Amino acid sequence: VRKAAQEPKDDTLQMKVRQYVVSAARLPIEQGTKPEILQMRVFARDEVHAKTKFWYNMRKLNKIKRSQGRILSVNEIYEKSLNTVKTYGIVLKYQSRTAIHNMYKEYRDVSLNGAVSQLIQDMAGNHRAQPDTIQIIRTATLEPKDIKRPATLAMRNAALKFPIVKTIHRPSEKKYRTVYKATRPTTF
RNA sequence: GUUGUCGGCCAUACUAAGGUGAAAACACCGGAUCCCAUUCGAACUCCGAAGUUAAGCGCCUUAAGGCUGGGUUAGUACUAAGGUGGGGGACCGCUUGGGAAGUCCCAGUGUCGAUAGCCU
Ligand SMILES: [Mg+2]
Ligand SMILES: [Mg+2]
Secondary structure, three states: OOOOOOOOOOHHHOOOOEEEEEEEEEOOOOOOOOOOEEEEEEEEOOHHHHHHHHHHHHHHHOOOOOOOEEEEEEEEEOOOOOOOOEEEEEEEEEEOOOOEEEEEEEEEEOOHHHHHHHHHHHHHHOOOOOHHHOEEEEEEEOOHHHOOOHHHHOOOOOOOOOOOOOOOOOOOOHHHOOOOOOOOOOOO
């Protein structure tokens, strides 16, 4: 249980993804040289986890292995303003029992970390995806001209109203909990 | 720079068609009385010195074949450890380690000697 600072006060409401930048270099490590540095953006729940994500992708993308290189640094990135709602696009590859797939997904959230967490839960529930399998190709905070999904564009209007049609009874604290009460609740 | 003699490694030395050839050697070359030799002096053996680089041989030539070394191939195939991982299964994949080979590329193409010499 280690929180990143930009996570909510209630741990419940969001997953423990954080967004990392990791960068490393070919091991020989020649001093005065101007090294090729390999840098990548990973989403993980740890520094360790991030390192893994890093290396996996890196050994797939290029010749390098870990005994062949060194980790220069791992730096968590944060979201600018948690005051506004943004529409995020994400581009994925994941692995389904048959084959591998490229998906584009959109979520309306306050954080790119939130965008990701929601992405994972969704991908589990609807697609039975395994986290380890998921590869996020590219992520963009979306400009309105660019938002393509109906359940996304669905929420743009000021005239938005939800009645709350059914209120399921939920006592305020536990101190108030009773199995059986002397009269029936209401919905509304 | 070049030669014979005996060589270690045994193609980067082999194969094919060519150019070139100071000197000295090596050879091709001349000849069968003698030791030796065969169906045959071809060869093997012996004795030589009229010719000759034409052979052998040195050195090089080929968008040459081969061989040698790297590149791609490819972090692919295969593989070590873990898995109350997925899949009806065949099988696939997650975490931590090792990691190849042919097509196609590019380069190389004999090296190390002891001994006596040629180039005054
Ligand atoms: Mg070869
Ligand atoms: Mg293959």
